[PDB]
């Protein structure tokens, strides 16, 4: 059936391909942007509609069921983490630059 990596990929930011973690915002048509890309943009990167601040509460609840890969996976980190632990892990991760 369904897998954790299948669910996690639904949170990928279409701009940086890191993960969109709570709080999760979206445009009128349902496109996501992460917290870090959002301030560098004047509109939705997918549809060019306004970014806005519609709240995707349901996706935040899904996120409590997903283990998200460390942002340093491409440097060789194999740890996957609940979203509440991801930031603290990445700050001390063996594979950070």
CB-CB contact of 35 with 11 (8 Å): no
CB 54 to a copy of itself: min, Å: 6
Q: Under a CB-based contact definition with an 8 Å cutoff, are residues 32 and 13 in contact?
A: yes
Nearest-angstrom CA–CA distance, 72 and 60: 22
Q: Is 47 annotated as a binding residue?
A: no
Shortest separation between residue 66's beta carbon and Zn ion, angstroms = 16
Q: Binding to Zn ion (CB under 5 A): which residues in 35-64?
A: 37, 44, 46-47, 49
Measuring CA to CA, which residue among 54, 52, 49, 66 is closest to residue 10? 66
| From candidates 7, 12, 22, 31, binder to Zn ion by CB under 5 A | 31
User: Which of positions 5-64 make contact with a copy of itself (CB under 8 A)?
Assistant: 6-7, 10-11, 24, 26, 28-32, 54-62, 64
CA angle 63, 66, 70 (to 5 degrees): 105
Output the smallest distance, CB 85 to a copy of itself, in A.
Answer: 14
Q: Residue 24: helix, strand or coil by DSSP?
A: coil
> What is the binding site for a copy of itself (CB under 8 A)?
1-4, 6-7, 10-11, 24, 26, 28-32, 54-62, 64-67
């Amino acid at each position: 059936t369904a897998s954790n990596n299948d669910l996690a990929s639904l949170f990928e930011c279409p701009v940086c391909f890191d993960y969109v973690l709570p709080p999760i915002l979206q445009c009128q048509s349902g496109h996501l942007v992460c917290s870090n890309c959002r301030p560098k943009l004047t509109c939705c990167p997918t549809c060019r509609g306004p970014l806005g601040s519609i709240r995707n509460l349901a996706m935040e609840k899904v996120a409590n069921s997903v283990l998200f890969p460390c942002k340093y996976a491409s440097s060789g980190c194999e740890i996957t983490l609940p979203h509440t632990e991801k930031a603290d892990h990445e700050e001390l991760c063996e594979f950070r630059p």
